[PDB]
């Protein structure tokens, strides 16, 4: 009577269909697990207690198919286990929650249902499914509260939201890895009671728990005791002691039996793209601190560039001063751009990997979704960085040169953003990705036509400058600023062999090549955390 018991025992969202089964027969795992064999049916709750897991992968991961090669046989619903069969019939809830902070529970559930339910279902059916999922896990009092890690919800509430997300498509087999990790005693008791109530229907729920101290062991239906990969007991927990005393190993008074026995040893692509871009926009436009920091740094750099090369006053800006100003305008943005893009990409790697492995989308709509989601704030950044400096430096007046400069800066920064995206998708860690990105950036910086004259390069630096967007940006700015004012200064230099539209097409081709590289990296390389 120490725990809360004024709860509702009604089932609002049950499973409709045939009962599911799971069979493991003489399974052995290497690179530990020896002679694992059990049989569970729908309607029962199996908890694997003890020291389970050889290395970085748990027992649930090796029985579900992840992870190191198995040497047994697993049967799912009478049929042998297979990756597509596991994806279609088995749902997994890990111990690390990965949800968007700027979203609420209802919006996230609606997005997951729209990305999971078939296209033939109407909006009313999706709304009814979301309402049933909310009422089943008693999340009606927090359906309009954000899941931000920001106050947001609590730990148990976030776990319930994750379980509801993984339970929206009505799975027949559910698996949980440490659901009560980092929760309070009452919260863990309530979560175990909720999982037991979910197992009360027509579902097969498996749970992995390390230490069921006092009540988690008492609320269990079926338990599996493991020691160094070897099973000891398999059956009802309430009789476990009665089994051990039947062999000659009694449990002492005032001692947990578990620890004492452990230490002894459809819908389509366009719809998915629309939902992804809408979710990304809704999650990005609600992050006030990040947008404010980006705008502040953009305005700071732009205004300090404008004030350092202030063209108004007594003396006007010279030729070399204008060249240095254009080179700095071209070469200062990439650092902050790459840093922000790499940080934003590595802040979503685990979530992207989980969404790609669980089968929501397959690297088709995510690409264009991320592009069109980064497009608007990047364009605002480009405006704030490029337009309130053209007037401070007192450059060539007019509308066409100003618009051409703005478009060239926008295209160059977009190419830099795509390059940073590709660098993030190519390497698994933040440090090596940032190092390779800064190396490429400094290589393209040295390949410019401002420091080494763009002519003292024999074969390789010239070929690098041929694919360097900074050199093309500097040449385009020089042609916009000095041509038809004027051509002889560009003629004595080597910045007059390529017209404006040619430079624009070269920048577009470089952006397309970087996009192709990013797509190949996303499709052929796993985004493992």
């Amino acid at each position, epitope marked *: 009577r120490l725990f809360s018991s*004024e*709860s*509702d*025992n*009604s*089932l*609002y969202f*049950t499973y409709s269909g045939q009962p599911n089964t799971l069979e493991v027969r003489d399974l052995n795992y290497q690179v530990g697990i020896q002679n694992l064999s059990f049989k569970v049916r729908s309607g029962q709750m199996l908890a694997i207690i003890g020291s389970s897991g050889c290395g970085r992968a748990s027992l649930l991961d090796v029985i579900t198919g992840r992870g190191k090669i198995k040497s047994g046989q697993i049967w799912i619903n009478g049929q042998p286990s297979s990756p597509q069969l596991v994806r279609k019939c088995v749902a997994h809830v890990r111990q690390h929650n990965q949800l968007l902070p700027n979203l609420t529970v209802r919006e996230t559930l609606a997005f997951i249902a729209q990305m999971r339910l078939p296209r033939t279902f109407s909006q009313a059916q999706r709304d009814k499914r979301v309402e049933d999922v909310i*009422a089943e896990l008693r999340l*009606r*009092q*927090c*359906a*309009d*509260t954000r899941v931000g890690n920001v106050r947001g919800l609590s730990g148990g509430e976030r776990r319930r939201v994750s379980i509801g997300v993984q339970l929206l498509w009505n799975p027949g087999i559910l698996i949980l890895d440490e659901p009560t990790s980092g929760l309070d005693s009452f919260t863990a008791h309530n979560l175990v009671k909720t999982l037991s109530r979910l197992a009360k*229907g027509n579902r097969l729920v498996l749970i992995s728990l390390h230490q069921p101290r006092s009540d988690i062991f008492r609320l269990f239906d079926l338990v599996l005791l493991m020691t160094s990969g070897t099973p000891i007991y398999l059956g009802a927990a309430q009789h476990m002691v009665q089994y051990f005393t039947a062999i000659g190993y009694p449990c002492p008074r005032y001692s947990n039996p578990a620890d004492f026995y452990v230490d002894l040893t459809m819908p389509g692509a366009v719809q998915q793209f629309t939902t992804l871009i809408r979710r990304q926009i809704s999650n990005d436009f609600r992050d006030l601190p990040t947008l404010l920091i980006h705008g502040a740094e953009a305005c700071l750099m732009s205004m300090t560039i404008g004030f350092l090369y202030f063209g108004h006053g007594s003396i006007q800006l010279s030729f070399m001063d204008t060249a240095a100003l254009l080179f700095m305008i071209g070469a200062l943005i990439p650092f902050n751009v790459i840093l922000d893009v790499i940080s934003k990409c590595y802040s979503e790697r685990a979530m992207l990997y989980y969404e790609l492995e669980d089968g929501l989308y397959t690297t088709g709509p995510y690409f264009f979704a991320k592009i069109l989601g980064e497009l608007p704030e990047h364009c605002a950044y480009i405006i704030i960085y490029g337009m309130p400096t053209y007037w401070l430096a007192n450059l060539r007046p007019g509308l066409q040169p100003f618009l051409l400069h703005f478009l060239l800066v926008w295209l160059v920064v977009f190419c830099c953003r795509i390059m940073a995206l590709a660098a993030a998708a190519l390497l698994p860690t933040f440090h090596m990705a940032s190092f390779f990105s800064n190396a490429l950036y400094n290589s393209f910086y040295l390949a410019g036509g401002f420091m080494i004259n763009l002519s003292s390069l024999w074969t390789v630096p010239a070929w690098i400058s041929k694919v360097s967007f900074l050199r093309w940006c500097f040449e385009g700015l020089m042609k916009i600023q000095f041509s038809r004012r004027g051509d002889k200064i560009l003629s004595v230099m080597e910045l007059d062999s390529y017209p404006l539209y040619a430079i624009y097409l070269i920048v577009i081709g470089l952006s397309g090549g970087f996009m192709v590289l990013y797509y190949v990296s996303l499709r052929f390389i796993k985004q493992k955390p």
Partner: antibody
Amino acid sequence: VKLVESGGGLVQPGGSLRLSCATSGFTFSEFFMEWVRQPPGKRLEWVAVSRNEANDYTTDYSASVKGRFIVSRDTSQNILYLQMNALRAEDTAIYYCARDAWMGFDYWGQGTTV
Amino acid sequence: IQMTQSPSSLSASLGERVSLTCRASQEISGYLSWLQQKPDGTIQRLIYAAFSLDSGVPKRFSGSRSGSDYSLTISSLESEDLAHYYCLQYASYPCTFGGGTKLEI
């Protein structure tokens, strides 16, 4: 969707009584069935609930009448039955028979005075 | 969760607009419904989820939410509006009803 109640009367304290609720126009096994009384001094209080086929026809009652009121259902004729024991202490009401509680109290009946 | 309904009594006539208020002690996230009890004894739900209306109800009733106060507004008062009104919450167990409102004209 029609709900009609019957079986009301006047009974001295210490006895027992059984009210009936006839349903029409929907599946009786796929929906909840609730008894919600309304005494005159009271405003509105739900007393009994019976779940659908998915919950093994489980029943539940509030702490005010836990132990004396028993709800049952007949699926052959789709009839709710409410058996009250030791009435008339403070159990004088206009008991109503409703369909859904968790999805909003909709399609109310007419109520019978006890 | 205690539901405070206002007002307990109100006087109006043909053509005017009435607005009843229901306040919850906790957060229900818009999971509120409105029940109407006719003088004969017929009870019927008019609005569910506090924003959507049922089928077969006149379009003069509507519901809104300001902060923590759920407001049921009925416009173009007619003779069909002499009854009792209650607000009901179903987001938490057990379900609790409102205090009541005697809409008399």
